[PDB]
Amino acid sequence: FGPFVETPIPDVNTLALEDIDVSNPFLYRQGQWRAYFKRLRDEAPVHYQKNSPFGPFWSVTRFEDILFVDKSHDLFSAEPQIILGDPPEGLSVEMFIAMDPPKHDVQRSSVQGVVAPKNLKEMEGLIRSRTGDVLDSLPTDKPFNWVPAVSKELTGRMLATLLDFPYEERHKLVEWSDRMAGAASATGGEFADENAMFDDAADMARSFSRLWRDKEARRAAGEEPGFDLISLLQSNKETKDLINRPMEFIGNLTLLIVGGNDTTRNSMSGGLVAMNEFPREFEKLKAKPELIPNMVSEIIRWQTPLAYMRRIAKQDVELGGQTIKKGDRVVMWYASGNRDERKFDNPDQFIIDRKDARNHMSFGYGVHRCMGNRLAELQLRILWEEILKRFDNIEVVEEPERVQSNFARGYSRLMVKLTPNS
């Protein structure tokens, strides 16, 4: 009903404050995002942009203010979408990441068992084995792209395990997720073909339905239930009939794959980029390997794989000396908050023994705090544990290529030369 090409981004000092548009999906790639958000934090921490390709929106850029917006779901709704823009027509799917309580609470309870700490503990052998195997497969006499060989490879195996997806088809979960999460209308991503998105959403719905029916058929034949989400959903009375609720069914399954896809991937890659910019931290790590758990938090803080989550004001809200109007879109820029010097001293430095590194907001805060935070930290810890066993040095031999997006902060190309230890 009713009615992106890259260009050089100018110095933020050349702009009136009302003309700063941080929805530009090239701000991260071009390294301008730090100066743009710092100007916002300093002089417009609750900022209204009237004109953007996504329409008007508020930017909330200070750590303390983002906490308030994220935790106050009675003032700022997560519905109906948490990306800055809109999904293409015909591709809206309800996910509980874009739902307020109580309904958010009910839907998250039906899937949260898949990351139960007892289950993650039991899967450590498999994760570490996969993490050992891919690392042993990497060449040490020539450089290679770390993104497909390591980050995406380990991420895709993990996603397959989570759903018991056919392993040989796991590349499909990632390709579908990338196209869906990289919609030009939603995040300024490079996917602008609505035809391919319609084909993906149909292949994906058909694939999840086949997986559901194959699993119930295997369970009816006596196969013991497992750790995966489908086994868990078919073991609980509330969700044993979830296929008869297609919106809930597709919504929960797509959220799990999109939630863990480029987040895990870009956190695996981003640690190497941070180490490259701050090489003394790798010597500190080698001499004190017990720093790995805290370093994982510092990698996640420094990388902030998801730059923001978006809300809609449910009423007029006074915040930062401004009046957010009912209905306005409000963007909580985690990428800015994690660089806020009011919260972190020396915020742009990668400091692996930073004592308050675990207080980052890359997972958000409030009822929507990332459900897979422990799963992500676990894979990242194991990754660096297995790196230290094998490699005395790691070299980035080319400027990393960063992904076009205002939402995902990640890398498509990371060329790495490995040096084994003695």
Tell me: is residue 365 an annotated ligand-binding position: yes
Number of residues that bind ligand HEM (CB under 6 A): 29
Nearer to ligand HEM, 27 or 331 (CB): 331
**Minimum CB distance to ligand HEM smaller for 39 or for 303:** 303
Pair 208, 250: CB distance under 8 Å: yes
Cβ of residue 421: shortest distance to ligand HEM, in angstroms?
27
**Residue 273 contacts ligand HEM per CB under 6 A:** no
Q: Establish if 333 lies at the interface with ligand HEM (CB under 6 A).
A: no
Question: Does residue 102 have a cis bond before it (omega within 30 degrees)?
Answer: yes
Residue 313 interacts with ligand HEM (CB under 6 A): yes or no: no
By CB under 6 A, tell whether 69 contacts ligand HEM.
Answer: no
213 contacts ligand HEM (rule: CB under 6 A): no
Q: Is 96 in the site for ligand HEM (CB under 6 A)?
A: yes
Select from 144-152, 169-177, 234-242, 261-269 the region that touches ligand HEM (CB under 6 A).
Answer: 261-269
- Residue among 21, 70, 228, 298 that touches ligand HEM (CB under 6 A): 70
Q: Is 263 in the site for ligand HEM (CB under 6 A)?
A: yes
To which residue do tokens 């303390």 refer?
64
The length of the chain is 422
Least distance to ligand HEM from the beta carbon of 337, Å? 11
Question: Is there a binding annotation on residue 368?
Answer: yes
Q: Which string of x and - marks every residue 148-187 that binds ligand HEM (by CB under 6 A)?
A: --------------x-------------------------
Residue nearest to ligand HEM (CB): 364
Q: Provide, rounded to whole angstroms, the least separation between the CB of residue 297 and ligand HEM.
A: 10
Contact set for ligand HEM, span 339-378 (CB under 6 A): 362-366, 368-372, 375-376
Q: Nearer Cβ to ligand HEM, position 12 or 81? A: 81
Strand partners, 393: 419
Strand partners, 20: none
Part in contact with ligand HEM (CB under 6 A); list of ranges 167-175, 228-236, 239-247, 256-264: 256-264
Answer positive or negative: Cα dihedral of 262, 409, 364, 360.
positive
Binding positions for ligand HEM, rule: CB under 6 A:
70, 96-97, 108, 162, 255-256, 259-260, 263-264, 267, 300, 305-306, 309, 334, 362-366, 368-372, 375-376
